[PDB]
Amino acid sequence: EVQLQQWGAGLLKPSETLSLTCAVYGESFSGYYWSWIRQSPGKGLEWIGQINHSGNTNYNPSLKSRVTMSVDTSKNQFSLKLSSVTAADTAVYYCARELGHDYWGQGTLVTVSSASTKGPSVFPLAPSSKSTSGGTAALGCLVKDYFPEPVTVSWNSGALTSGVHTFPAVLQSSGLYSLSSVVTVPSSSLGTQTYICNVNHKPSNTKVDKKVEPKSCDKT
Amino acid sequence: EVQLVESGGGVVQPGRSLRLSCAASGFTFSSYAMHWVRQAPGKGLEWVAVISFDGSNKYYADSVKGRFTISRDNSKNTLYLQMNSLRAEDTAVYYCARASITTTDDGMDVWGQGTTVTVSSASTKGPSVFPLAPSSKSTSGGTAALGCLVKDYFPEPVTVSWNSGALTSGVHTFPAVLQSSGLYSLSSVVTVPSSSLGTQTYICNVNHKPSNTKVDKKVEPKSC
Amino acid sequence: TNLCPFGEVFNATRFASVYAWNRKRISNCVADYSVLYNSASFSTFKCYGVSPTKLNDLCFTNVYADSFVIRGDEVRQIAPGQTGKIADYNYKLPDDFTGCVIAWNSNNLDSKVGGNYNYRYRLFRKSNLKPFERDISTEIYQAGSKPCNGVEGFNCYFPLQSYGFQPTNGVGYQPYRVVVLSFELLHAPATVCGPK
Amino acid sequence: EIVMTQSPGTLSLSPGERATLSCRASQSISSSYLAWFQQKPGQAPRLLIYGASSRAPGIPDRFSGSGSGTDFTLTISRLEPEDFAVYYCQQYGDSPLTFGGGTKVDIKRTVAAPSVFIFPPSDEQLKSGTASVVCLLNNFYPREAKVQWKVDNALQSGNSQESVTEQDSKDSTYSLSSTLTLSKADYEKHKVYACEVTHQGLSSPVTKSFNRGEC
Amino acid sequence: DIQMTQSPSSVSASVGDRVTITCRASQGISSWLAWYQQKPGKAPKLLIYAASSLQSGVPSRFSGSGSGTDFTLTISSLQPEDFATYYCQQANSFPFSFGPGTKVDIKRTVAAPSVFIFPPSDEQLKSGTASVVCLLNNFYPREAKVQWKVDNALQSGNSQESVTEQDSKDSTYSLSSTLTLSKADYEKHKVYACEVTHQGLSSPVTKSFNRGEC
């Protein structure tokens, strides 16, 4: 058996450099080729290169210019450096043994964005008398303009898990992220039972407890 | 089905030129390479030329260099061989051959029935027939050998039949021979019971197409 | 008089595989190079160190002609300071070498219907080759925590793999014949020389 | 680069059925050097088939492979819940390597008409300087569905973004959220907004409408 | 130009017998030798390529081996559809080359030629020539000589020989030797004789004709 531990920088900025390290524990570090593989939604599994215990590297012609490798036999580690990164190099990077048929790593998610920390803004998407579904109504909350991922969402301090479909994020033109969380409940508990959309972003130490009520039309 | 058919076979005099053409059917002509290979009368196979699947690489032997020119046309699926400065050392039977690979890393696998090529300045001529009657010296256990002889004819082929295609119990018609005169000759003999000579008639019937010639000649004892 | 044999090397019939490149020595000759770079068949006529038109005036000790066959997209690897299969696990040129590299298409001779599996290349090797080396060993490439004992199986593969040359392969996956002329000079007299 | 192409780009089956995925190469491949990889959510890939016909250790006998040249085929006789995942094809006969795009294997079930809802924005997002209207589609199968945003009987484009949920674990349905962004000026100058949904299970497009300042 | 020789010049065999045919070159062709088979009045039929492989649709009784400058083809159990002529072909370099050929005859008991003679008839002289003939029919093997002697003196340079084939009734042959001359040089001598030379022949058999011997 063999074990491979990954580490490296996550968030990054364009024109910068992405460095990653994989360490091997469980067998010999000499005699094999250790490879780096990449996975992005749209380009599928991609191969970057492989290095030996003596600095011998086989690269991919599509990245031979930007890719660089290193190997340290003392600590039994290998490392990748990818230069002039962009938002296209945002992906999951794996370290594997030669022809990964045998053993792979676990995955290091590297993200690239020129933005900086920010906290989410929460907006309640409430129901109305027209959202009736045979005695059932939907509602929820919209999280907008936050960075980086992820964001934790819950309801009634976590006292609700049915009908709660939380959706993935969306990279808007502002470099920030957005998502929406929802819930579906009988119309016999809208005006009586309370609903709250708790949001939590750790990189900003933001904990929001936003209430939600039907949009009571104030007659003026 | 795979099928190669050659054409361009006929008499021709020295010095002049000719063009043979092979037509293919049943496979992608524009990928296979093609070979021209001859066989002389009474001798073995001989290599003539090869051409690739595009026409840019051609190779010939050391006896047809300059005189012969091989080519092809993938449009009509045709393979051409232009012979120039023909000689009498080229009368032969020509075959087209397919090859999956130039240099024949795997060998030829498709051939044509072949087309004949005669090269002689002579002109068509009906045959001359002569009977080879039996002889007292050819008497052995009551067996008499007789026959006919065709000589000084041109071109090939000839057809012969003893007793209107009936007697086929020993007929040993031999092949042709190219004398120095330039024409051809061949004998046709047969054995008979020596007691049925002056009772039964034996007549050789000869037919030659290039001249529409039809002859019948009887063989009788050489009376004294 | 006594020209050099540049017809048994260039205008030959069957070349060798790049993992068994054919080397030939040339000495005591009057090698005339002008006939080479005065042609259009040679799609690639690079020359490192020397200049092409200045080749019929020098006088080297001996010349080494290495002939073989490769893909069309692998010709950029025949040069000093390159990387890939050909340059690492096969024919490797040193850094700052003196000589010339010629290459031209051979889709006529080295193309077959159904694939020419006679031309092979080394794909796996536990290390890189030193310059001007030849590894014809058909041993088994081990890539797992399990010995191969000379039996192909899981993670134990065969290094030599075949080019699938066909006549329909368009441009880059078409056969290209390559000849590398290394002009090796020494402290001994210059047997080779250009015409006059 | 030996480009590979997986066919189809998605499937829909049920436990007990049989699955067949195909990988087509741009050019003929070496002897039989093509491998089949499995990948599930979060985990890293795993090898099942090597040589296009061999079954690696720890691989149940239901995974089989076949093919040659530019056509290879993976087959799964008796599916199981652990088998619904992404599958890739790999070639280790020519350098560099080359993976496919993938062929997901989703669970199947009866068609389900989406439940559609439209949301009017809140004053807070307006005082922030923007507006975003939301269209929620719930509990619908299959995933093939289309959504259009109409502004007072007028189509839109280039500003509607949709996000899809994953196959549920109980009913195996899907959830979708479309969002249409509009500056508060453009949101106030118009009057009405409609979400038109088209789905296989729908007898006809469903148009949910709402006006500004409606109540 | 590589020259490809074969051996033996000919072979006599029987059904079920094991036949071997050798091929030699002058230079070294690694393994680029193919074997073709030709029958009288047909076209060749590829059998072996690479000197060891085999073409589809070819029985297994055909085998090939060798390398370098020596190759061999083998027929384990002959059959009636294998008596033919076998050619070799090299493919190491241009120009290519075939072999002279190696025939495969049929075996039987050594027969004896029923020798006969035929003199020039009248019409042959009426035209102005003369064609005498001697004949050796129903014999085996194919090796045999026909000597011509005019006036009891050997005469050559004006004779022709023709043989048909291995007959299909019982493995027999037939040869005709023709002596062609001018009426003038013919009417100068009297005794014209043809003598036979064969293996099964107990002793040579000379048969002659005197000019005017009716």
Residue numbers in the entry:
A (entry chain B): 1 to 220
B (entry chain D): 1 to 224
C (entry chain A): 316 to 511
D (entry chain C): 1 to 215
E (entry chain E): 1 to 214
What did the paper state?
Here, we report the isolation and analysis of two anti-RBD neutralizing antibodies BA7208 and BA7125 from mice engineered to produce human antibodies. While BA7125 showed broadly neutralizing activity against all variants except the Omicron sublineages, BA7208 was potently neutralizing against all tested SARS-CoV-2 variants (including Omicron BA.1–BA.5) except Mu. By combining BA7208 and BA7125 through the knobs-into-holes technology, we generated a biparatopic antibody BA7208/7125 that was able to neutralize all tested circulating SARS-CoV-2 variants. Cryo-electron microscopy structure of these broad-spectrum antibodies in complex with trimeric Delta and Omicron spike indicated that the contact residues are highly conserved and had minimal interactions with mutational residues in RBD of current variants.
